[PDB]
Design a protein around this nucleic acid. Structure first.
Lengths: 183, 183
DNA sequence: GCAGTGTCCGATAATTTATAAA
DNA sequence: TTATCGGACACTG
DNA sequence: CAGTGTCCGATAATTTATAAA
DNA sequence: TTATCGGACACTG
C-alpha cells in the first residue's frame, strides 16, 4: 500500500540524510517521505502535517527511532495514538517496535504506560523540589533590578511620574506601580 | 505455581496499606504479598530481595502499576529481565501489561526504547548551545573558588604546600594544581 | 623515622546549554 | 512565577 | 488634546527538573 | 566539562 517515512532533526541536515536514506531502503517514494527540522512540540509539526492529511487507513509510517517522532516523549505518544485511531500504523525501524500486527494493540498500550509513568516521575519531583525550594525561602521569578528607592526618592522630591520614567528609562506603569505597591 | 504480590511505597506505611489492599482486592493471598517502603537513600529493597528468592519458575507476581515495581525505568528493565529468565512473570493490574512469556521481552524493549529515546532528544536540543557557545568562548564548568593569587603568594613567600592548604582551608593537592596552572 | 613533598587519579561538586512549566 | 514594558481607557482641565 | 493615574495582556528573567559533558 | 577534595604511592627530610 502507500508506505511513508518520517524523519526529523534539530539542525543537523546530515543526521537527516542518514534517516531519509535509511527510510528509502524500505520506502522508495521520496514524495511520500516527509522530513522536519527545528524540533518543537510548541510549534514544529509542518512536515508531519503534510503526512497526516495524505495518510489514509491501512497505511504504514516508517520512522528510524522513537526519538524521531515527537519532540517530547509526550508528543510522540500523542501522534502514535492519533495515527493509530485513524488506522495508520507506525513502525520504528531500528527499535523494532511496531503498532500493527498482533503486537500492535499491546505495543501502544505499553508505550503509553512507560510514558505515563515517567511524566509523573518528573512532575512529582518538580513539585516536591519546588516546595522545598519555597520553604527554604528561595525566591522565584524575575530578580528585581529596578532601583525602586530612586523612583520613590524623586517622587518625594516633587518630581513627576513621567520624568522618573524618561530619565531612568523605564515604563510609566512600573514607575507608578513602584510607588503604588510600596507601603 | 504461586501467585505473589508486590508494592513499593511512596511516603511511608500509611500510603502502603492502600496498595496492599488493592492487591488483596485483586486476589493475592494476604501473606503472599511483599512490600517495600521506598527507601530512596540506598539500593536495598528487602521485601523484594525476599520475593526474588521465594519465586521459582512458573510463579506470577501481581503489582498495581509499573512505577510500583521499580525506581528508575532502568531498574525495571533488568528487574523484569531477571523475573523473565527465571520463568517468572508479572502483571501490572491497572495497566493490563503482563510480561507473560514473550511479552516480557516486548515490555523491556519499550522501556529501553523510551529511555534512550528521551535521552537522545534532550541531548539533541542542548547540542546546539553546547557546541555553539563552546566555540563562541563561554567558559564551561565549575566556577573557580580557591583564591589562586593568595595561594601563589604564600608559595612565592617560601611557604610549603602543607602550610598553604592548612592556612586557607584548601585541599593540599589544589595547592599544587593552582601552582602548576600556568606556572 | 613521623610529617612533608610531589605527582596522580577517583569521588563529589558545580555549571553550562536548552526546554517545559510556573 | 514574578517583574517590566506596552499601550489602551478613561478623566479633569 | 496632554497631563495623570489605572489596569491588564505580552514579554522578560528566573527557579526546578531533565540529562550529559 | 572544569574545579576541588581526599587520598594514594613512593619517597624525603
Amino acid at each position: 500500500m502507500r508506505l511513508f517515512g518520517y524523519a526529523r532533526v534539530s539542525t543537523s541536515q546530515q543526521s537527516l540524510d542518514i534517516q531519509v536514506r535509511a527510510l528509502k531502503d524500505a520506502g522508495v517514494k521520496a514524495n511520500r517521505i516527509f522530513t522536519d527540522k527545528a524540533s518543537g512540540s510548541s510549534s514544529d509539526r509542518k512536515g508531519l502535517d503534510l503526512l497526516r492529511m495524505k495518510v489514509e487507513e491501512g497505511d504504514v509510517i516508517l520512522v528510524k527511532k522513537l526519538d524521531r517522532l515527537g519532540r517530547d516523549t509526550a508528543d510522540m505518544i500523542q501522534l502514535i495514538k492519533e495515527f493509530d485511531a485513524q488506522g495508520v500504523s507506525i513502525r520504528f525501524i531500528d527499535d523494532g517496535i511496531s503498532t500493527d500486527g498482533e503486537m500492535g494493540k499491546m505495543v501502544v498500550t505499553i508505550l503509553s504506560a512507560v510514558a505515563q509513568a515517567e511524566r509523573q516521575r518528573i512532575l512529582e519531583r518538580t513539585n516536591e523540589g519546588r516546595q522545598e525550594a519555597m520553604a527554604k525561602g528561595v525566591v522565584f521569578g524575575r530578580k528585581r533590578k529596578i532601583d525602586r528607592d530612586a523612583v520613590l526618592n524623586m517622587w518625594q522630591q516633587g518630581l513627576g511620574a513621567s520624568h522618573i520614567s524618561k530619565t531612568m528609562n523605564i515604563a510609566r506603569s512600573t514607575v507608578y506601580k513602584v510607588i503604588n505597591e510600596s507601603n
